[PDB]
A = this chain, B = another copy of it.
Amino acid sequence: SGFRKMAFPSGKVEGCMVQVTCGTTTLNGLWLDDVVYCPRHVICTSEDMLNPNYEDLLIRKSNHNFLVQAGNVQLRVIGHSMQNCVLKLKVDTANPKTPKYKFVRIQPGQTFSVLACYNGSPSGVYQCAMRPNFTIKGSFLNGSCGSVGFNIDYDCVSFCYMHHMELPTGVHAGTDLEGNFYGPFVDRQTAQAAGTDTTITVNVLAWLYAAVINGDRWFLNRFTTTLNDFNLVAMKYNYEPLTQDHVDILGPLSAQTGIAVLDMCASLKELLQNGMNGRTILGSALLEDEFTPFDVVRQC
């Protein structure tokens, strides 16, 4: 029994974290095969960030300006190129611990584990969701840029996130491993704000299913609803629309519990329109939305 916000084991990713230094800036890089990936703003001073032309700033850099250390060992940079907002530093040595891996771009609402790092040293591991506004509510202190997020499937590590920046509101933004930012953010010092965040409806439902599976059933009811009627209510409470693809992804949990997705949707409607009235679900007083359907199945 038991249900916790659970991160993937981080060993495979710990073996890939390295330290990258350009001038006074030190941050983290990801060492896979003979390439080290890191944020391209590693080449910028704080003053360059006002209006940087990364193409120019990178033309003025030599491989010997990039200091890469894997633990105590220095790694010789022998080439460099920029892909969107990520710098690719080719090194003379292939990471002998490179796991089987992929680069994937996740959709809002998807979860991943984050290996927080400082000057190449892993500090902690926690679970995150890509918010619908393409921010993440993480814990990234100074020297954490280049920390990565990932999921693991059958010994294969799917890297999905690299940390680049923090807004004045304290929320975090970054890129996939091809350098494309999630959300409307840019790696320069200009005005940018995250849109209004919403609740990940399909994840709340998956979590309610986790509650049932774990014996918490007080919120269940006999009632059913239609998808349109549910989303009309969902709209009002700042929930993301529930699509028929969501209903399909929830099918396996519906089967395990014998509760139709639309039966559970009526339970959720009632919680939105009446609150909880002092009770809790899985020990939470709010509806949790950072568990995907797949997270629940993996842990139930």
| Interface flags, A122-139, vs B, CB<8A=1, else 0 | 111110000000000111
Q: Chain B residues near A115: list those with CB within 8 A.
A: 9
Q: What's the Cα separation between A161 and B137 when bound, in Å?
A: 30
A45 close to chain B: CB less than 8 A: no
**Interface 0/1 of A60-73, CB less than 8 Å to B:** 00000000000000
A299 surroundings in chain B (CB, below 8 A): 124, 139, 141
Residues of B within 8 Å of A300, CB to CB, are 141
Q: Is A235 an interface residue (CB 8 A)?
A: no
Interface of chain A, main secondary structure: loop
Determine if B284 and A7 form an interchain contact, defined as CB atoms under 8 angstroms apart.
Answer: no
Question: Which residues from B are CB-within-8-Å of A258?
Answer: none
Cβ of A14 within 8 Å of any chain B Cβ, yes or no, is yes
Which residues from B are CB-within-8-Å of A10? Answer: 9-11, 125
A286 within 8 A of B: yes
Interface residues of A in 206-256 (CB under 8 A from B): 214-215
Q: Which residues of B contact A138 (CB under 8 A)?
A: 2, 4
A137 to chain B minimum Cβ distance, whole angstroms, is: 7
A166 lies within 8 A of chain B by Cβ = yes
CA distance A235 to B15 in the complex (A): 47
Question: In the bound complex, what is the Cα–Cα distance between A170 and B213 (angstroms)?
Answer: 12
In the complex, residue of chain B having the shortest beta-carbon distance to the beta carbon of A215: B170
* B286 touching A1, Cβ below 8 Å: no
The 18 sampled A-B contact pairs (Cβ below 8 Å) are A1-B140, A2-B137, A2-B138, A3-B139, A4-B137, A4-B138, A4-B139, A6-B116, A6-B123, A9-B14, A9-B123, A9-B125, A10-B10, A10-B11, A11-B11, A137-B283, A170-B215, A285-B286
